[PDB]
TrEMBL record:
GO terms for biological process: proteolysis. GO terms for molecular function: aspartic-type endopeptidase activity. Keywords: Aspartyl protease, Disulfide bond, Hydrolase, Protease, Signal. This is Putative cathepsin d. Residues 40-358 form the Peptidase A1 domain. InterPro entries: Aspartic_peptidase_A1, Aspartic_peptidase_AS, PEPTIDASE_A1, Peptidase_aspartic_dom_sf. Belongs to the peptidase A1 family. The active site is at 58, 249.
Length: 361
């Protein structure tokens, strides 16, 4: 058991929306990392002596990458960079890599070195030395790179994900799991935490409801249904009626699903489609907005409007936005961002290949 503290920051997509600037997505070939949407980072260090970094701990991807000292692009010059020549434990690989991101590609070459995750010491860990990171308005971003916590099958050639090497090296004891506490509250000192090799009882109430992983790549599982139900409507909103597939993604905020289904959901909520793509709700009519519920392994996971409405500062206008939007992919998926993962503590279990949810504390 070792514990990494997470810090929450306002996403670049949000900073853009405040100045009244929107960028359309997509459609996507499948779920992609998008650096405009990432909201939680935590510290790691690489090499000997340690070189310090802030990275996104991302269940939506499986790669570890950081800006290379050899990268002199704008993004890299504005962040911490890994210098292999300064580390006595560096071990060369040298092969090239490319990753398709929603925010523009990430490219470079593979290297190996000690990766430090709090008190844990991951040895011979492959990483991407990034020479290219796309694109606009990431010069402020408080994170340097990404550390992926998904399965090895969606890693680039030459990388084994960080958690997998923690497993091979016996660093987690008997529980090959990691647990994630996300605090969406702006005020609090702790933004959240990732607990490696354990489950923290202090962070949830009730019991944990497990769901089996369906396709090993993303942390992907089956959802029984999605619905919203209200005393103020002649009909319910019933979606995902015959079951659907979802992924848990700590690398994003909004809940994303098949467009026609979430458009319908947003209409039911009284939403108004912005030219930006998000749906506006009346800020004075948030009180009687119905819960939206996800049924997983026969159990209901309810979201209150307090959980799913996002507030944004436009100019002077405070302005309220639905935390659900459509994103088409060929193999339709609900992507569960922090809107879902904030009010639910989440256990990621590689022993049994399952994901656990319990009410947060
Ligand atoms: N990107």
């Amino acid at each position: 058991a070792f514990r990494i503290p997470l810090t929450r920051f306002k996403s670049v997509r949000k900073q853009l929306a405040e100045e009244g600037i929107y960028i359309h997505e997509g459609p996507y070939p499948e779920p992609l990392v998008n650096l405009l949407d990432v909201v939680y980072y935590g510290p790691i260090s690489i090499g000997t002596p340690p070189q310090d970094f802030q990275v996104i701990f991302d269940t939506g991807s499986a790669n570890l990458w950081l800006p290379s000292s050899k990268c002199t692009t704008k993004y890299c010059l504005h962040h911490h960079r890994y210098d292999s020549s300064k580390s006595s434990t560096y071990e060369a690989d040298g092969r090239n890599f490319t990753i398709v991101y929603g925010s523009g590609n990430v490219e470079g070459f593979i290297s190996k070195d000690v990766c430090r995750i709090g008190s844990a010491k991951v040895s011979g860990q492959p990483l991407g030395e990034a020479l290219v990171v796309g694109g606009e308005s990431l010069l402020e971003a408080p994170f340097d790179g990404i550390l992926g916590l998904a399965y090895p099958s969606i890693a680039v050639d030459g990388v084994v994900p960080v958690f997998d090497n923690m497993m091979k090296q016996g660093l987690l004891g008997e529980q090959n799991v990691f647990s994630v506490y996300l605090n969406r509250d702006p005020s609090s000192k702790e933004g959240g935490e990732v607990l490696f090799g354990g489950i923290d009882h202090d962070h949830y109430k009730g019991s944990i409801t497990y769901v089996p992983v369906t396709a090993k790549g993303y942390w992907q599982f089956h959802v029984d249904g999605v619905k919203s139900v209200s005393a103020s409507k002649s009909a319910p909103e019933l979606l995902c009626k015959d079951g659907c597939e979802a992924i848990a993604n700590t690398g994003t905020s909004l809940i994303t699903g098949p467009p026609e289904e979430v458009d319908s959901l947003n209409q039911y909520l009284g939403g108004t489609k912005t030219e930006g793509g998000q749906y506006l709700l009346d800020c004075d009519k948030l009180e009687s907005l119905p819960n939206v519920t996800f049924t997983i392994s026969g159990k209901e996971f309810s979201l209150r409007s307090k959980d799913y409405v996002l507030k944004v500062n436009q100019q002077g206008q405070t302005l309220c936005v639905s935390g659900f939007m459509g994103l088409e992919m060929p193999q339709p998926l609900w992507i569960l961002g922090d809107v879902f993962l904030g009010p639910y503590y989440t256990i990621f279990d590689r022993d049994q290949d399952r994901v656990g949810f319990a009410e947060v504390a």
